[PDB]
Amino acid sequence: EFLTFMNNTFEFINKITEETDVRRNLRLKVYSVLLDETSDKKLIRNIREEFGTLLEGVLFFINSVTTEIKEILFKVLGNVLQILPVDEFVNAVLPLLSTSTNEDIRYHLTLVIGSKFELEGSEAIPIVNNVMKVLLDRMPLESKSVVISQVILNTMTALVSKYGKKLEGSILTQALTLATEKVSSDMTEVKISSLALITNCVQVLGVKSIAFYPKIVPPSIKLFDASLADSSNPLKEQLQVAILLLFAGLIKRIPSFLMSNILDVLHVIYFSREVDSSIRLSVISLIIENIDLKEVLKVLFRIWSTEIATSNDTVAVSLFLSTLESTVENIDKKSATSQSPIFFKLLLSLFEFRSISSFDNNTISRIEASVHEISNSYVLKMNDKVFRPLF
Amino acid sequence: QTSKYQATSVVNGLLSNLLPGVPKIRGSKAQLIDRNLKKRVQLQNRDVHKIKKKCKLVKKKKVKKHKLDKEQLEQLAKHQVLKKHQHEGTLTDHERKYLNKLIKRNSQNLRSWDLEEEVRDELEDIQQSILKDTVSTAN
C-alpha cells in the first residue's frame, strides 16, 4: 500500500532528475545560471542552499530505508550529485558536514566528496586546499566516531596520493602531524588509516618529513611488536601490511636516514607472520636497490645470531636466505672485500646451524646448499690478499 | 565490516601504488623453503613497469572522457546564455565580439559560393548577349 506508493514516489524524482535540449535538462539549466554573469549572486546561493537540503534529504531516505526502493534512491542520488559542478558542490556541502547532526549522514557526506575528486584534475587544486582545512578541523570533533574518523582519514589519503604535491605545503605538514598523533589511537582502524596517510605524506614530502622521523618509525616498530601479541585482532593482517607498506614507501623515499634503524625493519619483515610471503619478499628487494648493501650485510649477521638462528621459523629463515643471496649477487668488488670478515663470521654460524636447528635433515641439507652457493659466489669476486688470512 | 571494507580498500590502494604486481588482500618444511627461493627470482623477473603503465592509461582515459564531457556541456550552456542575453539585449562586450566573429565566419564562407570578381565580368558580358536576343526590345 504505502510501500508500493512509496516505491512509486521515488520513480518520479528519478524520472524527473534522470538526464534522458538545453531547456529540459535540470543539470544544464544550473550551469547556464552559473555561467550567466548577470545572474544575481543571491540567486546562486539559493541554488547552493537548496541543493544541500535536497542532497541531505535523499541521503536521509537512503540511511533510513525494500531492495528495489533502495536501488532507486541511488539512481536519484546519482542524478542529484551531477546537478551542479565541483566548484559549487564543495561550497554547498562542506558547511553541511558540521551542520549535519546524524553520524550516518556525516558518514555519507564524506564519501561523496571523495568521489567527486576521483575524476578531477589540476583545476580543483584550490578546491582541494579548502576541503583539507575543513577536514583537518573536523578531525578533533569527529574523534569520537571511528567510522567517521576512518573515512575522513581515508579521503585525505586518496587525495594526498592524487596531485598531493601541488597542494599547499602547510596542509601537508599539518596532515602529517595529525596522522602521527592518531597512530597511537587504541582502535585498529585509526592506526591503519594513520599509517596509510603517513606513507603518502612522507612520499610527497620526502626529505622534508625527516623532522617527523622520530615520530614515525620508532612508534611503528613498537606497534609491530604489539601486533604480534594481539593475534585475536580481526584486522591483524591489514594492520601488519600497513606497517610493512609504511616501511616500503619510506625505504624508497628516505633510504639513507633508515640505514641506522634498518635492523628493526628486517625484524618486521621476517616475523610478520600474517602478511603474504610475496608482500614480504617484494619489500626485501626494495631494500637491496635502495639501501647501501654494506650496511645490510653487517646487520644480517646480528639479526641471524640474535633472532633467526633461534627463531625456528621456516618463513623467517627462508626470507633471511633470500636477503643474503640477493645481497651477495649485487654487492660490488670493493665492498665485498672490505666486508669479508663479517661475512665469514656469519658463514661459520650458518655452518653451525645444524647443531641448534630443530628442523629435519632435509630442510637443514637444503638450507646448507643455499649457504654453499652464496659462499662460492662470495669467495669468488675477491682477491688473494684478502682471502688468504680468512682461509 | 565497513571497518573491514574501508581497511582493505586503503591498504589495497597503497599496494597498487607501491607494489603493483603483488596480489591484493581479499607439508614438508623443505618444500616451503624451495618455493620461497623460487618466488624470489620470478618476482625479480616480473615486469612491473608495464603494469604501472596500464593502470595509468586506464585512468587517463576516464579523466579525459569526463574532461570532454565538461568541455562539451559548458559550451551548450555558454551558447544558451548568448541566446537569452541577445534576445533581451543584455549583450556584454565579450558576447558582441563572438557573434561578430560569427558574422565574419559565415560571411567568409558565403564568399566562396559568391564566386570571383574576374569571372562575373565575362559572365555579365555573356549574360547580356543572351537576354537581348531572347528579350528582343528592338520593337
Binding site: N63, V147 | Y5
Partner: peptide, 24 residues
C-alpha cells in the same frame, strides 16, 4: 531440417559502501 536446426544453433563504489554500512 532437424539437422539444419542443430547447425543453426552451433553457429558504484560508494553504492557498495552505502549498502555495507546499512547491513552493520
Amino acid at each position: 531440417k532437424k539437422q539444419v536446426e542443430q547447425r543453426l544453433e552451433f553457429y558504484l563504489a560508494i553504492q557498495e559502501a552505502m549498502e555495507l554500512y546499512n547491513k552493520d
